[PDB]
Amino acid sequence: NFNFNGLTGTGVLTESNKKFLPFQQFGRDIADTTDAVRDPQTLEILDIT
């Protein structure tokens, strides 16, 4: 049960195969729910399933 910058939620986190911009935080779906985040205090990028 995650909480990233106040956005709670549930899922399994895993390392990203994506290439993230450098100006960024949230990757968002057609369903309009979070799919990919960046850590609020790390530079690693995590895919949310």
């Binding site: 100006f23 960024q24 968002r28």
Partner: protein, 224 residues
Amino acid sequence: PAYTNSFTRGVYYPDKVFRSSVLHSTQDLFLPFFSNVTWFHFDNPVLPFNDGVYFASTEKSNIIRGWIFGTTLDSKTQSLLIVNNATNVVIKVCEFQFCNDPFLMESEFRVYSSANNCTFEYVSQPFLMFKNLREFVFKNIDGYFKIYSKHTPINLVRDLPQGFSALEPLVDLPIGINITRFQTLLALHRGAAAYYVGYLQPRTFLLKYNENGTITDAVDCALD
């Protein structure tokens, strides 16, 4: 005067969102395709902001070295200024005064009007030294001011070449002031350098990301 056909350039990322292999549509404040820009060149008159400016100085240029931003350009309304000293950038959100044509054993420091009543400062790396074409996009929506550049070499120094140029976010800056009219900076070294001004308004784009998740193609609505 001197209506130059700005063809295609001036697209930018909204913000968060990495995607890939998507055909996705957004809705922000946008610069028209095939629009006209008054050519500028020695000569540097005054310009208003009008909610969004696509700055694009020419290639083979070493003259423009900063900007003065504001609303009134007086010592009352909070002003904004950036200076590259060839190894850093010096961002001043201080309060300034009027100078009609400031510029830069090669001499400097003539440009400054007054350094009273500072509100914010910022220091970062310089942007970049047939040349990598300087392009900049300027907008403020409720505080967040942003930086955009994509620098690319081509021929045809004066006229803009066709092609494609996404504008990439560099420094997001939450200041929270007004911007209505402004002036860039120059450098008179004993002088007609070219630059262009664009405008944003809520038109409708259509974006395509590649397999790497980068904008490669885009279209708008009111064209055809």
